[PDB]
Ligand binder design. Structure first.
Ligand SMILES: Cc1ccc(S(=O)(=O)Nc2ccccc2F)cc1C(=O)Nc1cnc2[nH]ncc2c1
Length: 164
């Protein structure tokens, strides 16, 4: 099971960890990817998860997009978790660097409520450009299922806990 997490609320937990290493250790039922609408896993959490699957996540994702077209900002799809998890929930939070609406962050977190427990990153944080303190607030006020947040950056983890 999950270990070494700090409890923030009844259902939200947080740890300073690399989500790839956490997924390889725990083999959760669901790992969340910080996806874009095209499922092009180039950088950030998506690039790191895809590299850990030896590009199998990108080959499956390209077939999904060829069949279904792009996701919506704030939407998600469930695909294989490959060697990392049973499933990967690809969730698209708004990318502030591309000018997307930050109000869509709550819609993005609502996708997590379809799964009893998830290993996840903070949506729209990092290279997506939003304030991670805001992302954690929307996560706690939106997600009702059990979420284990992995924050890679130690300095950001300490700021997120100390300002919670
Ligand atoms: C800058 C940074 C570096 C590294 C990490 S990470 O390694 O924890 N995660 C991570 C890295 C890449 C892709 C996606 C990820 F989630 C996060 C951040 C972060 O979000 N900081 C931060 C702090 N205050 C801010 N205010 N407004 C914006 C803003 C951003």
């Amino acid at each position: 099971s999950f270990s070494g997490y700090l409890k923030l609320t009844d259902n939200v937990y947080i740890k300073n960890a690399d989500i790839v290493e956490e997924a390889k250790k725990v083999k959760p039922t669901v790992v969340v990817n910080a996806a874009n609408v095209y499922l092009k896993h180039g950088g950030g959490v998506a690039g790191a998860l895809n590299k850990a699957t030896n590009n199998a996540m990108q080959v499956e994702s390209d077939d999904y997009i060829a069949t279904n077209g792009p996701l919506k900002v704030g939407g998600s799809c469930v695909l294989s978790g490959h060697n990392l998890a049973k499933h990967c929930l690809h969730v698209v939070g708004p990318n502030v660097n591309k000018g997307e609406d930050i109000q869509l962050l709550k819609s993005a977190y609502e996708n997590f409520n379809q799964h009893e427990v998830l290993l996840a990153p903070l949506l729209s944080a990092g290279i997506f450009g939003a304030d991670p303190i805001h992302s954690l607030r929307v996560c706690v006020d939106t997600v009702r299922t059990n979420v284990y947040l992995a924050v890679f950056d130690k300095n950001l983890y300490d700021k997120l806990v100390s300002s919670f």
